[PDB]
Amino acid sequence: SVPSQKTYQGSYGFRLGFLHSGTAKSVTCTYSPALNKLFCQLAKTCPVQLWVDSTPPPGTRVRAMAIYKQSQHMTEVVRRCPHHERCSDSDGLAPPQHLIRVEGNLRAEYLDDRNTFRHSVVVPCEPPEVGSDCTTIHYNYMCYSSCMGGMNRRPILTIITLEDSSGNLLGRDSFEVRVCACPGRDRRTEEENLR
Numbered sequence: 001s002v003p004s005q006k007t008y009q010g011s012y013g014f015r016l017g018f019l020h021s022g023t024a025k026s027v028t029c030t031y032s033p034a035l036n037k038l039f040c041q042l043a044k045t046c047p048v049q050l051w052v053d054s055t056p057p058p059g060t061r062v063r064a065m066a067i068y069k070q071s072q073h074m075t076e077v078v079r080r081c082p083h084h085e086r087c088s089d090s091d092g093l094a095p096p097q098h099l100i101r102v103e104g105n106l107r108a109e110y111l112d113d114r115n116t117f118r119h120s121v122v123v124p125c126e127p128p129e130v131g132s133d134c135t136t137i138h139y140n141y142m143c144y145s146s147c148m149g150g151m152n153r154r155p156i157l158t159i160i161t162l163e164d165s166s167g168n169l170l171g172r173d174s175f176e177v178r179v180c181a182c183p184g185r186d187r188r189t190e191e192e193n194l195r
């Protein structure tokens, strides 16, 4: 009833990477290594690098899923709030209830788990382009952390899993996410609080 969040590089040396976007007031997505926390604006591009030490098999996939970070909320499905699930901002592929979308990939698949009712979005692994050492996926988060009747100010984690063609676990990594109006300011504030 609770997805694992244990970091696991596995046989292929799987791990995430994040850009260095800084903390200017205008920044739309920014990652804090000290907090292991991504700060982003609503529905804006969040680039996440997918690193491996060795090539996984054809048919390997990468899945993203959100869970609540606090243990007392972890069995609750993370979903869009009663406003945003109804605001008709469909991209033609993501169900309107899903918090996490993949941008610009027609092979993205959206799962409503028939047993756990959790949402996830999964894409096929592709080889890096010539000149690149990794591929990058672009996520969008479709509700604010503060949305009433939804996340309601509760922090979430995103869990990224590398899966074989059956859905078996090959690798796992994760990061906290705050979806907010001013990611640069909030990253600076939280890093200062940590210090």
Ligand SMILES: c1ccn(-c2oc(C3CC3)nc2-c2nnn[nH]2)c1
Binding pocket: 050, 051, 052, 054, 055, 056, 057, 058, 059, 060, 062, 125, 126, 127, 128, 133, 134, 135
């Ligand atoms: C996301 C995570 C791994 N991959 C990946 O998939 C593949 C072929 C199976 C398609 N090669 C890579 C690779 N990435 N960096 N180097 N090689 C995509």
Ligand SMILES: [Zn+2]
Binding pocket: 080, 081, 082, 083, 084, 085, 142, 143, 144, 147, 148, 150
């Ligand atoms: Zn919302």
